Swiss-Prot record:
Highest taxon of source: Eukaryota
Residues included from the entire protein: 163 to 262 of 1380
Residue numbers of N6-acetyllysine PTMs: K38, K46
Species the sequence originates in: Mus musculus (Mouse)
Region (siRNA-binding): 29-33, 81-83
Family: Belongs to the DEAD box helicase family. DEAH subfamily.
Protein name: ATP-dependent RNA helicase A
Subunit note: Component of the coding region determinant (CRD)-mediated complex, composed of DHX9, HNRNPU, IGF2BP1, SYNCRIP and YBX1. Identified in a mRNP complex, at least composed of DHX9, DDX3X, ELAVL1, HNRNPU, IGF2BP1, ILF3, PABPC1, PCBP2, PTBP2, STAU1, STAU2, SYNCRIP and YBX1. Identified in a IGF2BP1-dependent mRNP granule complex containing untranslated mRNAs. The large PER complex involved in the repression of transcriptional termination is composed of at least PER2, CDK9, DDX5, DHX9, NCBP1 and POLR2A (active).
Annotated knockout phenotype: Mice are viable but have behavioral and neurological abnormalities. They exhibit hypoactivity in novel environments, tremor, and sensorineural hearing loss.
Function: Multifunctional ATP-dependent nucleic acid helicase that unwinds DNA and RNA in a 3' to 5' direction and that plays important roles in many processes, such as DNA replication, transcriptional activation, post-transcriptional RNA regulation, mRNA translation and RNA-mediated gene silencing. Requires a 3'-single-stranded tail as entry site for acid nuclei unwinding activities as well as the binding and hydrolyzing of any of the four ribo- or deoxyribo-nucleotide triphosphates (NTPs).
Subcellular location: Nucleus; Nucleus, Nucleoplasm; Nucleus, Nucleolus; Cytoplasm
Amino acid sequence: GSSGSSGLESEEVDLNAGLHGNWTLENAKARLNQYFQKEKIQGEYKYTQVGPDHNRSFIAEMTIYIKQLGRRIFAREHGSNKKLAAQSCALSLVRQLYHLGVIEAYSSGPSSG
């Protein structure tokens, strides 16, 4: 494994990308951890393995309470592995946070190139 020492963007972004939200499978997993660091909240994914051990997939689920709204949000999703499952779960919390107005559309530009 490896990574860069800094990140930058100098590219343009569409106006409709602020209406659909730039939250992706990985940028949502980051944004849910950012929400937990800013609010002093903690959350861990509940997993369930499905299928036979020679050909399996994983379900992942999470539920969190929002003290700034007075309610909670829940998700349950699945991938071919725990990473894909938790990625799909995170995007399902983050797109409910965006729908309820706890967050806005992400600043990262189009994935088309």
